[PDB]
Amino acid sequence: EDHLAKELEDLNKWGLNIFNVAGYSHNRPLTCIMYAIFQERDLLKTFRISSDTFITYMMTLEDHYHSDVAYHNSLHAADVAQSTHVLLSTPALDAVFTDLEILAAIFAAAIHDVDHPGVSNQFLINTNSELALMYNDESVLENHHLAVGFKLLQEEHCDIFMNLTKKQRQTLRKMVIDMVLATDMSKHMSLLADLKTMVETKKVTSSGVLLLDNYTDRIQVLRNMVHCADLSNPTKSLELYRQWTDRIMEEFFQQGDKERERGMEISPMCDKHTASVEKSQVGFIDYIVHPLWETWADLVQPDAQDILDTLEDNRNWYQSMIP
Numbered sequence: 108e109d110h111l112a113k114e115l116e117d118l119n120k121w122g123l124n125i126f127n128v129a130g131y132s133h134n135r136p137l138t139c140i141m142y143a144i145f146q147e148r149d150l151l152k153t154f155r156i157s158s159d160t161f162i163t164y165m166m167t168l169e170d171h172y173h174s175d176v177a178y179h180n181s182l183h184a185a186d187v188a189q190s191t192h193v194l195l196s197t198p199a200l201d202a203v204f205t206d207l208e209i210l211a212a213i214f215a216a217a218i219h220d221v222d223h224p225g226v227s228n229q230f231l232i233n234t235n236s237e238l239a240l241m242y243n244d245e246s247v248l249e250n251h252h253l254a255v256g257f258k259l260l261q262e263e264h265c266d267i268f269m270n271l272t273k274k275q276r277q278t279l280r281k282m283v284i285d286m287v288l289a290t291d292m293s294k295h296m297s298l299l300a301d302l303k304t305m306v307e308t309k310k311v312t313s314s315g316v317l318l319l320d321n322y323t324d325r326i327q328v329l330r331n332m333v334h335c336a337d338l339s340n341p342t343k344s345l346e347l348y349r350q351w352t353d354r355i356m357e358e359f360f361q362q363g364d365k366e367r368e369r370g371m372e373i374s375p376m377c378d379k380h381t382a383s384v385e386k387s388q389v390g391f392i393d394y395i396v397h398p399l400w401e402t403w404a405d406l407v408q409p410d411a412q413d414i415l416d417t418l419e420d421n422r423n424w425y426q427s428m429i430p
């Protein structure tokens with residue numbers, strides 16, 4: 108109600124508590140936060156999208172995330188979308204992207220885990236699930252999330268890119284596909300090397316504004332920018348990071364419980380009788396989150412310093428939660 112408005116004063120800030128907005132939106136953060144972002148960047152105006160259209164798409168999209176799934180529900184889509192919108196406002200990337208590119212980034216972030224079943228690519232491959240067979244075991248869920256996001260834009264009343272050029276809509280679909288595929292954890296390490304080499308060639312202007320040559324350079328930053336938004340939980344306030352931990356931990360144990368019935372080998376971080384939730388978070392920050400965010404901060408320094416502090420802080424709170 109009036110509390111929703113209060114929370115959207117932080118739409119442009121990293122400090123947005125998305126759990127709160129979900130509460131003041133009839134349990135619909137992704138719609139809310141998507142509407143709120145597009146209005147804020149005038150994307151509805153710049154791209155001839157009717158609110159009527161945009162709302163019905165987002166609602167249908169949002170209803171396609173499983174609400175009975177602990178982490179990969181509509182709330183997480185809403186959060187990557189909002190994070191990506193903050194990251195896109197980072198000073199070291201000012202006016203570096205076209206609005207077409209900006210529009211592709213956020214939309215990507217929003218459909219990026221759509222219709223996620225609560226289990227891993229590995230589980231679906233090992234169980235011979237229909238999705239694995241449909242997708243020949245390569246970036247399975249990521250391919251799917253994309254398939255669904257775009258299948259909904261085919262229904263006339265739902266196509267939000269309907270008033271986009273044919274050239275532009277194609278450039279979009281190509282950028283969006285590229286980005287969602289980049290959120291596959293198995294491509295993480297190679298994608299980290301790509302960001303590292305790019306940082307060693309970091310060219311800018313006098314104003315601490317990076318210079319990107321063509322597509323290759325601009326879609327790589329956007330690739331990694333979404334990837335970091337997806338792995339942004341350990342850089343948020345402590346109060347929101349633990350809520351996110353409990354949510355992913357609960358999805359992972361429930362995956363463990365399905366792996367046990369089946370008598371498949373359980374994946375240690377998915378084992379609810381052996382796994383330290385605390386150790387799981389420390390390693391995730393040491394081997395995955397920090398190396399990424401260190402390189403991102405290097406790319407945009409000093410824009411991400413505040414974020415790196417909080418990362419190394421939360422990290423040590425979790426270290427302390429161990430005997």
Ligand SMILES: CCOC(=O)c1c(C)nn(-c2cccc([N+](=O)[O-])c2)c1C
Pocket residue numbers: 290291292337338340341348351352355387388391
């Ligand atoms: C908040 C703690 O996060 C986790 O420990 C954790 C681990 C491990 N993997 N992931 C994870 C799982 C599926 C997909 C992604 N990612 O693609 O965003 C990340 C998370 C959120």
Ligand SMILES: [Mg+2]
Pocket residue numbers: 219220248249290291
């Ligand atoms: Mg995903």
Ligand SMILES: [Zn+2]
Pocket residue numbers: 183187219220290337
């Ligand atoms: Zn995700």
